[PDB]
């Protein structure tokens, strides 16, 4: 709606019988595949991400943002605890570090 991509700002400038908008926008530059999982089963408990999605590089797992690859180690601050491992579909086995 406001330019093309994720919107940062728009600067208006006048024009004779018109207005021109300079839209500063955010565009994802490069792409990369990752393996993903909905939740992590640790100590018999299901862990769901508070913010971000789970990605995997090789065998090891991180949680990261949807719009930028900033891998952070999974922590009890990063994920919240709810449910059980049985009812969730697609859960993988991993560990949850705690500070």
């Amino acid at each position: 709606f406001c330019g093309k991509g994720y919107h940062l700002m728009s600067f208006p400038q006048s024009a004779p019988h018109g207005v021109v908008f300079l839209h500063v926008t955010y565009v994802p530059a490069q792409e990369k595949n990752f393996t993903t999982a909905p939740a992590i089963c640790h100590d018999g408990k299901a862990h769901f991400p508070r913010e971000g999605v789970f990605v995997s590089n090789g065998t090891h797992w991180f949680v990261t943002q949807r719009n930028f690859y900033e891998p952070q180690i999974i922590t009890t601050d990063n994920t919240f605890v709810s449910g059980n491992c049985d009812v969730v579909i697609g859960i993988v086995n991993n560990t949850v570090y705690d500070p």
């Binding site: 595949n33 393996t35 697609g90």
Partner: protein, 50 residues
């Protein structure tokens, strides 16, 4: 020519695959929108009588 629907693209849906950006681009685009049309009016004495 036939009207372009746009650039052709293909993405492979998967139940266990995600695509996360590694780099980002800050872009300035231009959108031009008309605001007003030049106001006109008619003089009735000139239009009818002259």
């Amino acid at each position: 020519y036939t009207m372009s629907l746009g650039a052709e693209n293909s993405v492979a849906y998967s139940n266990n695959s995600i695509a996360i950006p590694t780099n980002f681009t800050i872009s300035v685009t231009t959108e031009i929108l008309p605001v007003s049309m030049t106001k006109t009016s008619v003089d009735c004495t000139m239009y009818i009588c002259g």
